[PDB]
Every structure is written in structure tokens, then in C-alpha cells.
Amino acid sequence: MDVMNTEVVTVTPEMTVSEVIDLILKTKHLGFPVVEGERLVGIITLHDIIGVEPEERVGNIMSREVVAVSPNQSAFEAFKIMSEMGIGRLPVVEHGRVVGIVSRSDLMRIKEILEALEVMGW
Amino acid sequence: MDVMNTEVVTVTPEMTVSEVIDLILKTKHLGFPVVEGERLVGIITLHDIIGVEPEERVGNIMSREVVAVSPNQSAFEAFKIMSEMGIGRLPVVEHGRVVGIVSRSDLMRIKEILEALEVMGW
Amino acid sequence: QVQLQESGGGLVQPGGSLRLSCAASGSGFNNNAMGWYRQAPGKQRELVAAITSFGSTNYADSVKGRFTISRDNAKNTVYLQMNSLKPEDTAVYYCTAGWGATPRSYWGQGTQVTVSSHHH
Amino acid sequence: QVQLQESGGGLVQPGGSLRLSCAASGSGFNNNAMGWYRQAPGKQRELVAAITSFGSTNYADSVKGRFTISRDNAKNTVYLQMNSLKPEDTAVYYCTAGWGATPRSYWGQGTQVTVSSHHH
């Protein structure tokens, strides 16, 4: 899939809210896939850690319902899913293992250049 | 690369203009990559066969300057190249072998649905 | 509309010969281009040979000359004759159909061809 | 800014132990998460273990328990201790660095680890 980031920032169910906030401050990501090794087990967002004690573990806060896409799908399918579900990031998994991630932020900038493009083709 | 057709219609340098016209009438494609086996050796278009005798072979009419893309590139790079060069199709090769083809027609329809999309995300 | 059924194939001595056959059935078949692809144990699928309804052939350089392809248009059958077989020719050979010099639209289940020195 | 240099690795008996080491250099390294990936002869790259600056570990299920990872924060060095090694553990082991439970931003040149029964 195009517009896929292979350097995914993930967390484990045993990491604490405190360490996740440090990942947010470091990587500027507002959400992370939860993994056991590379196997996707959940998703966590900035909204989930609102008012949560910093010692709380991720596994008790994360959502186990995780929407994902396959590397065989296109960036336009991921854009459609993120627009339909209202989410800002979409993990890309293959055989249950996270192989990448697609952000709504990247595809929103990809739509702009597409409009900037296609005026040279006339 | 997204929006890639793996069922490429190709020709050989030894096929005749007559057989290429039959491929145009059958497949509705207005251009074909020229191959020796799977190795890309040239490109031929409908403009090249204008006024050419039907017994003429493809190798004497085709263009050996062939613009191509890698499967590691994105459909937006192929769209940019086709808009910049003014071509309607772009062969996708890897190790000199044609592995797919991307048409300007598909990407032009992909841009429309992108505008149709992104109104549900608001 | 279109179905392909391979035939033949097996174990052959290095330098031996072997003929693969493929019959195309279904009302959707209409003088399509037919060809052969192969896939080595740890490599990707790869074109061997192809032939159009006009009789125009297309060979991969590695099998050029050693392999010959022909087709019976009335019977919708393509044949792959292999000679001077090498151990590197060992692969699963798939019969394909479509249009052009590299037809990939329809595929058969594949047939195994093994080229290795063994007891005569 | 960031460079990784593997250390150790070689041939080990099935059920034996082996310790891999990796030192991170460069002014760009700043308490990054460090980990180990491996690639079998005919398979894709695959996570073995990882550890963050906070000390949080992450193991692939296949190596869980048998392998242990630790890191010296002052020396920017990560260690992979492998025990009860299996022939399926044979791979090129790459040292990685980045952020999170699966750091992939920076890579080392890799080091070979071979687990097979051989003459003592």
C-alpha cells in the first residue's frame, strides 16, 4: 500500500500511561497500536488516557476492537475507512503482525498535491 | 504500487502492425509495451501506427526510449510522471521485466472519487 | 467462460525432453493468447513462452531455442515442448490465457516439472 | 547522529546459549528504544525483542522466555541473551533503534547466528 509508514511507533499492554505520554511528547503521535511482539492486540489513543492515572497499564485502557488494513489494499481504501470510521491512523497488518501504519494526516496532504498536480497535464 | 494492472497487454518487436490493430480493437488499449519475453524493450502507441503499412513489424516503429516506474514508487508518482510527460500509460518494471502497468485513465477516475470521498469525513 | 487444464509433466533427466499440454474450455474462450508461466521453489512467477491466435510467439531468453510452443486453434489447446532441460528448469508450470505477448488473465492449477540427475 | 554496531554471534549447538551485543554511537542518539530483528534464509525480517529507555520489554512469542534483552543506558548498549537455542533460530540478527515497542528507524549491518548440530 502506498503512503505507508514502515517505522511504526507501538506500545505494549504492560507499558504505563506515563510512558505513553512520553511517546506522545517525543514522536508527536496522538495514537499507537498495541502489540505483543509484532502481533496486533489493541489500539490506544490520546482520548483514552484523559484523566487516567499515570501508573495505569495500557492493557486496561486500550481498545481491543482494532480496525486495520492489509498491505494488498490501496491508500484510497485506507482513506475511505478512516473517513468512514472517523479515525486518524490505520495500522497495516499481515498475518496478524503490524507491518506499517497509514495516517489520515498524510493522505490529507496527498489530496492537496493531487489538486496541485493535474493542472500541468492540461 | 497502487492502481496497478498486473494483466498487461504487450507486444513483441516481431509482431506486425496488423496484429497490433487487432489488439487495439480487442483490448481497447491505445498503446502497448514492447517486450522480449518479459524484458521491456520499447513502447508503441496508436500514433505510431498512423499511415504505417500493416505488414510492418513493431520493432521498426516502436520507440526505444520508454519511461517506466518501479513497483516501489506510488501511484501519485506515476500520475505526476504521466502528467509531466503527457503520456496515457506507464509500464511498471522490476529488474527490466514488466510486472504491471498504470493508466492515466484509472488515476483520473481515482481523483474524482477522492473528491467524492473526504466529504463524509467532515 | 474460461478454464485451463494442464497436462503432462514429471521427473526428467538433465538434457531430456518433456511436452506439456493445456486445453482451454468454456464459451468465453475466443482465440485468446495462450502461454506458460513457471515458479521455481523460492522465486516469483516467471514467463516461459506465449503464443497469440495469429501464431506470434514470445520466449523468455533463458528458455529461448530449447523450448518451443505451438497451439491448435480448432481445439483451443497449447503445447510446450521442452528440450535440453536443465536443473534450473525445475518449477511448477502454469498454463495461462489472455491477450498479447504476456497473457495473464486466466490460469490453470499448475503441473510439476522436476529436472535432476537420478537413477536410470 | 545514530549508528549501530552488532557484536558476537556465530555457530552454536542446539540448546546452547549465545549473547549478542550492540553499541549505539552518534550525537543523535538520545535514549532511543533499541531492539533486535532477525531474518531467516528464506523469510522476511522479524522482531525478536525490544526495550525502551524506561526498561519496558517486548518479545516475539517464539522467543519469549528463552531470550532476554537488557540495555546499559549510560553506555547506549543493548544486549540480547539467547538460551535454549533451536535450529529455527538460525538467522541474520540486526540491531535496531527508534521509538516504541517495535523500533525500526535505524539498523546495523547484521550478524550471523547459526544453530545446528555439529561435531563437538
Min CA distance, B111 vs chain C (Å)? 27
DSSP 3-state percent helix, strand, coil across chain D (nearest 5): 5, 50, 45
B95 annotated to bind ligand: no
Chains with 3+ CB–CB pairs under 8 A to C are B
CA dist B22 to B16, B110, D4, Å? 10, 29, 59
Q: Tell me the C-alpha distance between A100 and A70, whole Å.
A: 9
Q: Do the Cβ atoms of D96 and D36 come closer than 8 Å?
A: yes
- CATH number of the domain residue C6 falls in: 2.60.40.10
Query: Regarding beta strands C45-51 and C33-39, do their DSSP bridges make them parallel or antiparallel, or are they unpaired?
Result: antiparallel
Residue D4 and residue D93: Cα distance in Å, rounded? 12
Whether B121 sits inside 8 A of A83 (CB atoms) is yes
In angstroms, what separates the C-alpha of A75 from chain B's closest C-alpha? Answer: 7
Q: Contact at 8 Å (CB) between A35 and A41?
A: yes
Helix (H, G, I), strand (E, B) or coil at B26: helix
What Rg, from alpha-carbon coordinates, does chain B have?
16
Contact: A83, B117; criterion CB under 8 Å: yes
Q: Nearest residue of C to residue B97 by CA position? A: C46
- Domain of residue D112: give its range: 1-120
Asked whether the beta carbons of residue B120 and residue A84 sit closer than 8 angstroms, the reply is yes
Q: How many residues does chain A have?
A: 122
- Give the number of residues written for chain D: 120
Instruction: Please give the full DSSP string across C34-85, using - where no structure is assigned.
Output: EEEEEE-TTS-EEEEEEE-TT--EEE-GGGBTTEEEEEETTTTEEEEEE-S-
Q: CA C48, CA C83: separation in Å to the nearest integer?
A: 13
Known binding-site residue numbers of A:
9, 29-31, 45, 47-48, 67, 88-89, 104-106
Q: Give me the number of domains chain C comprises.
A: 1
CB atoms within 10 A of CB C61: 10
Verify whether the Cβ–Cβ distance B114 to A117 is below 8 Å.
no
Cα-Cα-Cα-Cα torsion B60, B64, B65, B66, nearest 10 degrees, comes to 110
d(CA A40, CA D91): 24
> Quick check: B121 and A1 CB within 8 A?
no
How many C-beta neighbours within 10 Å does residue B120 have? 10
Q: At what angle do helices B75-85 and B104-116 cross, to 10 degrees?
A: 120
Cβ neighbours around C41 below 10 Å, total: 8
Binding site membership of A for ATP: which residues? 45, 47-48, 67, 88-89, 104
DSSP assignment of D76-113, as one string? Answer: TEEEEEE-S--GGG-EEEEEEEESSSS--SEE---EEE
Got the DSSP string for B38-85?
TEEEEEEEGGGGTT--TT-BGGGTSBS----B-TTS-HHHHHHHHHHH
Task: Give D98's contacts in chain A (Cβ within 8 Å).
Answer: 7, 9
Question: How close A108 comes to chain B (CA, Å)?
Answer: 9
**Cα separation, D37 vs D60, whole angstroms:** 10
C-alpha cell at B95: 529488474
User: Measured between beta carbons, which residues in chain A are less than 8 angstroms from residue B82?
Assistant: 121
- What type of residue sits at position D81? Q
Name the strand (E) or helix (H) holding B116: helix B104-116
DSSP structure string for chain A: --S-BSS---B-TTSBHHHHHHHHHHH--SEEEEEETTEEEEEEEGGGGTT--TT-BGGGTSBS----B-TTS-HHHHHHHHHHHT-SEEEEEETTEEEEEEEHHHHHHHHHHHHHTTSS--
Determine, for residues A9 and D99 on separate chains, whether the beta-carbon distance falls below 8 Å: yes
DSSP B118: T
Q: Please give the backbone phi and psi of residue C86, each rounded to the nearest 5 degrees, phi first.
A: -110, 155
Tell me the C-alpha to C-alpha distance, in Å, between residue A9 and each of A20, A119, C2.
10, 37, 47
Phi-psi region of C55 (alpha: psi -120 to 50; beta: other; left: phi over 0): left
What do you get for the CA distance between the two ends of chain A, in Å? 28
Q: H-helix or E-strand containing B111? A: helix B104-116
Nearest to B118 among A75, A83, A86 (CB): A83
Q: How was this structure determined?
A: X-ray
